Amino acid sequence: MGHHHHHHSHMVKETTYYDVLGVKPNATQEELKKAYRKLALKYHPDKNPNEGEKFKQISQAYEVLSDAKKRELYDKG
């Protein structure tokens, strides 16, 4: 139990960039920042190197999500 891993699901097949950040498809640029902040608190790589592997995904998706332009272009193709 615990609130560190509320989901705790071991099922993972094709995770979306929105899913990785735990954010909505209509999430705002602000919400995108907040998603990363929330995840950072939970899976902080400097605190849990074991979850840093997951955080690799977070960092990448955040990289494009932190900028509406990249987010748009990426989704465009």
Side-chain angles (χ1 to χ4, degrees), residues 37-48:
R37 192 179 298 180
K38 185 177 181 178
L39 308 175
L41 293 174
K42 295 295 181 180
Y43 308 102
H44 200 88
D46 300 278
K47 201 175 181 179
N48 299 89

Side-chain angles (χ1 to χ4, degrees), residues 6-51:
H6 191 102
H7 299 86
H8 196 73
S9 185
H10 54 271
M11 296 179 64
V12 48
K13 299 179 180 180
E14 182 179 20
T15 319
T16 60
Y17 307 101
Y18 307 170
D19 192 275
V20 177
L21 276 292
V23 92
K24 299 180 305 185
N26 64 330
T28 65
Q29 203 285 328
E30 184 189 273
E31 186 162 307
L32 277 22
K33 293 182 180 182
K34 289 179 178 179
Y36 172 83
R37 192 179 298 180
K38 185 177 181 178
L39 308 175
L41 293 174
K42 295 295 181 180
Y43 308 102
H44 200 88
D46 300 278
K47 201 175 181 179
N48 299 89
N50 179 273
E51 293 294 63

Side-chain angles (χ1 to χ4, degrees), residues 42-77:
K42 295 295 181 180
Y43 308 102
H44 200 88
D46 300 278
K47 201 175 181 179
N48 299 89
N50 179 273
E51 293 294 63
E53 290 173 88
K54 293 188 180 69
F55 203 82
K56 296 178 181 180
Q57 291 181 328
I58 294 171
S59 305
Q60 297 178 32
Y62 176 71
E63 186 51 70
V64 16
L65 270 51
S66 55
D67 177 69
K69 181 183 179 184
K70 296 176 65 178
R71 184 180 186 249
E72 199 278 297
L73 309 188
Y74 196 55
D75 252 273
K76 183 180 181 180

